[PDB]
Write a protein that binds this ligand. Structure first.
Ligand SMILES: [Mg+2]
Length: 293
DNA sequence: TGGGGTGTGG
């Protein structure tokens, strides 16, 4: 599941991402490599990258009119299938938090192909920040990664701007939106490959091949989703659910990691699910094959 | 800026 969003403010939203299973926001992309950036994201260097102030001698901003300036960039959030989320946090399977991360690196890398600048020329490089979270605003397991793309790419010499000027030809983000499904798709496919290799089973449960591990009590950890549909309902348009997603949206919360982890384990019991039996069933499934043909 | 739900995203 890949969702999109425009970043419209540096300093402010620059923090947002700078802020419960062990807590890794790492850089990514050929562009982030050029500027010499690796698996760490300084609150300041990032907050800067959004204004147009690269680490390199590039200051592509527009600090005019008090505080009217550049265009920060975009947020491509890949959300993992609820069963994957649960198994990692409630099932303690750390191998999953990994698979998910590899699945994102794969996707985010296919997005970099569309990296192009205005003059339209595929510049094949991006400077990105990838933040990982594991809850929903409803406080449930909801592991996802905000692949924040900085509004900058590198053409021939200096850095330009992915974002466009005026209409001309569809620039970067235009194609991203035009290609959402494919991206959420191949992210989901990568996670899939690994997850099954670990010995887990999966079945389709939604459009464009969305899936989950069969048997895992998903319905019980989809509080946001349900609150959104109890409001605007089912059969509601995507746009209508966008607004619902925002109204009924609780505000960002300070949870007591162990009070919450316990509520989950507790609520997890009432479903009648045997977490342990599942991981083992998966192991035996994986073991059973790698030891045959 | 278009579009799948696990619903994130000043
Ligand atoms: Mg988040």
């Amino acid at each position: 599941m890949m969702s999109i969003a425009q970043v419209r403010s540096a300093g402010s939203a620059g923090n947002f991402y700078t802020d419960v299973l062990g807590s890794g926001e790492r850089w990514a992309g050929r562009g982030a490599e050029q500027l010499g950036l690796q698996g760490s994201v300084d609150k300041d260097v990032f907050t800067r990258l959004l204004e147009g102030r690269l680490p390199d001698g590039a200051d592509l901003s527009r600090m005019q009119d008090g505080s009217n300036r550049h265009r920060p960039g975009y947020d491509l959030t890949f959300s993992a299938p609820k069963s994957v989320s649960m198994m990692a946090m409630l099932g303690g399977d750390k191998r999953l938090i990994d698979a998910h991360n590899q699945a994102v690196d794969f996707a985010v890398r296919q997005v970099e192909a569309l990296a192009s600048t205005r003059v339209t020329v595929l510049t094949g490089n991006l400077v990105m920040a990838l933040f990982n979270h594991d809850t929903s605003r409803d406080q449930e397991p909801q592991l996802h990664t905000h692949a924040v793309v900085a509004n900058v790419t590198q053409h021939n010499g200096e850095w330009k701007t992915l974002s466009s000027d005026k209409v001309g030809k569809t620039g970067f983000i235009e194609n991203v939106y035009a290609n959402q499904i494919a991206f959420g798709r191949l992210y989901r496919e990568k996670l899939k490959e690994q997850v099954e290799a670990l010995g887990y089973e999966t079945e389709v449960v939604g459009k464009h091949g969305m899936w989950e591990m069969p048997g895992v009590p998903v319905e019980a950890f989809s509080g946001r989703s349900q609150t959104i549909r109890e409001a605007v309902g089912e059969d509601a348009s995507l746009k209508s659910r966008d607004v619902a997603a925002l109204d009924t949206r609780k505000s960002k919360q300070h949870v007591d990691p162990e009070i919450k982890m316990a509520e989950w384990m507790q609520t997890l019991k009432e479903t009648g699910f045997d977490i342990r039996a599942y991981r083992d069933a998966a192991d035996q499934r994986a073991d059973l094959r790698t030891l045959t043909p």
